[PDB]
Amino acid sequence: DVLVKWSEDLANLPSIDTQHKRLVDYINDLYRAARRRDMDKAREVFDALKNYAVEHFGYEERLFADYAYPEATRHKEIHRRFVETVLKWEKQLAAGDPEVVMTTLRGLVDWLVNHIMKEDKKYEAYLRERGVS
């Protein structure tokens, strides 16, 4: 049913929480599709997850630019490398089965939870003190 449950460990600015929660929702939708052994749905949800991640990353990067965040370059490159990684993982889904979907899902969750807690956390105080919400 649910692979990832939201918790305070993932919390950041309120607007950012809406996007991270949406990503967690896509992860759980992809888990559900894998459990149902529905590969067409899994490929559809994976595509939609990737596309939303790109837009979430762009929203963060726009905050970094607007607010002259000193680690903008580093954090953008981290996002870019993960987009590249996600595009590589996507290729396996064409011939994959639900077990490939699960392995992929574990990689997605591991990256996202670490990224939110380790990298996204670094911009939070910086943006809060500048009035971002």
Domain residue extents for the chain:
1-133
Q: How far is CA 127 from the centre of its chain?
A: 20
Q: What single string gives the DSSP state of each residue in the chain? A: --S----GGG--SHHHHHHHHHHHHHHHHHHHHHHTT-HHHHHHHHHHHHHHHHHHHHHHHHHHHHTT-TTHHHHHHHHHHHHHHHHHHHHHHTT--HHHHHHHHHHHHHHHHHIIIIIIHHHHHHHHTTT--
Amino acid at 101: V
Comparing CA positions, the residue from 32, 83, 12, 87 lying closest to residue 53 is: 83
- Give the CA distances from residue 53 to residues 19, 36, 47, 79, 121, in Å, rounded to whole numbers and listed in that order: 9, 24, 10, 9, 17
Experimental method: X-ray
The end-to-end CA distance of the chain, in Å, is 31
Write down the architecture of domain 1-133 according to CATH: Up-down Bundle (1.20)
Q: Is 44 annotated as a binding residue?
A: no
Token pair listed for 123:
């911009």
- Give the CA distances from residue 130 to residues 11, 28, 111, 120, in Å, rounded to whole numbers and listed in that order: 18, 33, 28, 16
What's the rounded Cα separation, in Å, for the pair 89 and 101? 10
What's the rounded Cα separation, in Å, for the pair 26 and 46? 8
Residue with tokens 């990737």: 50
